[PDB]
Amino acid sequence: FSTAEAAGVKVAAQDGQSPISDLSVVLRGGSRYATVPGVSHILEKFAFQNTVPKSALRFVRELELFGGKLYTHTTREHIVLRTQFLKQDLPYFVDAFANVLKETKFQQFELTERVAPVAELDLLKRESDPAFTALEAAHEVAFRTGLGNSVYAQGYSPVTLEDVKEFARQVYAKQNVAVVGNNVVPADLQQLVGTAFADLQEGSKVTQAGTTTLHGGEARVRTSTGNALTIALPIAEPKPVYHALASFLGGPASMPWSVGASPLAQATVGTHTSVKATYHNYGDAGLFAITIKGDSPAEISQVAHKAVQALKDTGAEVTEEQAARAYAKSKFAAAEAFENPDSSASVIGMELLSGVSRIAPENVQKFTPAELSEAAAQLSASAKPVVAAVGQVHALPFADEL
Amino acid sequence: YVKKPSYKIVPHFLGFNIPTVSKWIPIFGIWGAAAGIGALFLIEGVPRTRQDILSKIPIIGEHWIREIPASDNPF
């Protein structure tokens, strides 16, 4: 991806040999920058509604004539709006993004009838998985605000049209916008962005209200719809070794009808439970999480004990084989993330907006068994463990039990 | 490179357009034949229908040319 600048907008593109292009506008407008809970979700859902030049209806009917597709999502850091189309249709898609950023009519009826109901279905679908809920609850305990804000709009905190219009006034500005083109000729994109996004406000960099603070604790979400448990550890100094540690501890199986050879996968034997270790870098803080879902609260409890033990055992000793396995699993995870257009866009988006130079999968560091064990030791001995239980919470573990 | 999709709006009225209606023109034709045959069949007994239409059909038309002998007719 050749980084350049076109009329004050950061543009990154990589030409390829395929008939299909992906253009993604990445906005510094994710939930950590939210002003009101849920506004970044609502603003994401308000993309490609009625603009002054082109109605939502006209946009969708024309998009079907190009056979293009539209994908949007919100993270803690970004709102990502992606279009996928045939290479030659690039100018239409650039102009469409320009209309959205410059000329969206944020109309109250769209909020009530279109945007908010879709936002609500989005959340209900995500929450059907209790592991999603547990990991969201864990971020809320660990960070409280900023990274602890909810990503998604909820019913209890109603977002108003004035809320969304204010946030959009900040976010939809040259300082918060990056354009990322996969299989787009870089010279052609710079020319088009330079004509289309010229009259966009300059605005100012959106900032997190307040510094990231770390906290420990417990969240207990009573659902009747399945059981999960996250064990998170907030990280004050995000380091790349936690990727290797997450991949080492593992949890999911690497082949069908098997359990897996990872320490966390081996913790599930004899139970209908699954486990996944994850590491989330957010620049200034991070979160190392182990999520366990299952239908039996008794089994989840059982696995949770083994999970904590596994992390302590890692802090003691890792073999050379295991450290190499972690390098392999981690390089692979990095490679597939840079391939998937969803995550790809946000990776370069973070390089363009924030300035965090991307780590190419081929340049993923190999951590010695010493470095891995030291990282695990630093986690087992954390002052601020977070535990989020979801489901039959009376039967799930507590932080002090773990 | 393509800047705009290529299309026009065809004239329409009450949700009908010429491409659609033109597909149904033959069907109206057959329905009209059905209605014609049915109507004619319904009035086949009317003497005027026989005199003016049915008796004039070649070959077949003699089916409707029938005379009561004067000896058998009170009127």
Residue A212 lies in a domain: no
Nearest to A30 by CA among A208, A174, A197: A208
Q: A336 by DSSP, 3-state: which?
A: helix
- Are the beta carbons of A119 and A45 closer than 8 angstroms? yes
Chain CA centroid to CA A311, Å: 24
Distance in angstroms (rounded) separating the CA atoms of residues A309 and A251:
14
> CATH number, domain at A45?
3.30.830.10
Phi, psi (rounded to 5 degrees) for A112: -75, -40
Specify whether A172 is located in the same domain as A257.
no
Torsion sign over Cα A52, A57, A63, A69: positive
Distance in angstroms (rounded) separating the CA atoms of residues A253 and A261:
8
Pairwise CB contact (< 8 Å): B2 & A92: yes
All residues of chain B having their beta carbon less than 8 Å from the beta carbon of residue A188 are: 1
CB neighbours of A44 closer than 8 A, spacing ≥ 6?
A72, A73, A74, A79, A81
- Are the beta carbons of A63 and A70 closer than 8 angstroms? yes
Specify whether A157 is located in the same domain as A229.
no
* Residue at B44: amino acid letter: E
The count of structural domains within chain A is 2
Structure-determination approach: cryo-EM
Specify whether A271 is located in the same domain as A382.
yes
Element (H, E) at A275: strand A273-281
Specify whether A231 is located in the same domain as A191.
no
Q: Which residue of A has its CA nearest to B8?
A: A62
How far does A187 lie from chain B, in Å, by closest CA? Answer: 13
Pairwise CB contact (< 8 Å): B3 & A66: no
- Pairing relation of β-strands A386-390 and A217-221? parallel
Residue A35 lies in a domain: yes
Containing structural domain, residue A261: 217-401
Question: Between A62, A90, A188, which is nearest B5 by CB?
Answer: A62
Specify whether A313 is located in the same domain as A229.
yes
Nearest to A20 by CA among A73, A72, A80, A89: A89
Specify whether A139 is located in the same domain as A177.
yes
Specify whether A125 is located in the same domain as A230.
no
Distance in angstroms (rounded) separating the CA atoms of residues A85 and A66:
7
DSSP state of A172: S
Q: A116 by DSSP, 3-state: which?
A: helix
Residue A87 lies in a domain: yes
- Residues of chain A contacting B, Cβ within 8 Å: 62, 65-66, 88-92, 95, 188
Specify whether A33 is located in the same domain as A179.
yes
Nearest to A31 by CA among A168, A197, A152, A166: A152
Specify whether A158 is located in the same domain as A256.
no
Containing structural domain, residue B20: 1-75
Residue A359 lies in a domain: yes
Residue A32 lies in a domain: yes
Specify whether A177 is located in the same domain as A118.
yes
Starting at the edge strand found earlier in the chain, the sheet holding A79-86 runs: A2-6, A9-14, A177-182, A20-27, A79-86, A69-74
Pairwise CB contact (< 8 Å): B3 & A62: no
How far does B3 lie from chain A, in Å, by closest CA? Answer: 5
The count of structural domains within chain B is 1
- Are the beta carbons of A299 and A248 closer than 8 angstroms? no
Residue A383 lies in a domain: yes
